[PDB]
Design a protein around this ligand. Sequence first.
Ligand SMILES: Nc1ncnc2c1ncn2[C@@H]1O[C@H](COP(=O)(O)OP(=O)(O)OP(=O)(O)O)[C@@H](O)[C@H]1O
Length: 213
Amino acid sequence: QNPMTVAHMWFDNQIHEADTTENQSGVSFDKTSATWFALSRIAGLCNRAVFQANQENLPILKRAVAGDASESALLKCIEVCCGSVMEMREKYTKIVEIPFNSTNKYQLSIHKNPNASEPKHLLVMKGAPERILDRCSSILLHGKEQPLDEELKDAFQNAYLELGGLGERVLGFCHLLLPDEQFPEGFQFDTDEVNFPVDNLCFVGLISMIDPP
Ligand SMILES: Nc1ncnc2c1ncn2[C@@H]1O[C@H](COP(=O)(O)OP(=O)(O)OP(=O)(O)O)[C@@H](O)[C@H]1O
């Protein structure tokens, strides 16, 4: 149906819009890409939906999908102007990517990162917003951290619950900026020999959507 977009995202701890009324351009909105940089990195690699290859002559929003039962809307506001995911699949060498199976309700992907302010190894998570929140004890405010607490849980909860909370509708999308010097050059984590933290980390925020116009 029609175009779609994100509309609502939770990044400020308080929703406060996040779509530029009158018409969609960057009229007066700053780039400032800190939270956005992460919310475009995770959002890229940690995706399964694609635009069935690229495009012959025709719009991103009327390609098709290929993908699995999560969403494609997660990607419809990435490949538009945020970056080639079909490229970043190979840009990042893809260290390890623990499956969720049916207990975990989260996935991980470690990955390297050659470029930008990101450490040479990082980690990214996706999965059910609550089941992430279990470990997730920070949140990311305009490139800064904040400590999560019962109050920041509340802010998350009432947001998440406004957005859906039904099933697969809201996802979590978090990361971890791992150390360079204090981690191994051999990227030797494995899935057996983990050695990586799975704790407070950095929640980043909710890449939720809308569906009615
Ligand atoms: N690619 C994905 N990456 C991460 N999480 C995803 C992805 N696609 C869907 N999810 C997750 O699917 C997971 C499984 O929970 P879900 O409620 O879907 O189980 P189910 O097996 O369908 O349950 P039921 O047996 O009741 O139908 C949830 O963690 C949800 O976040």
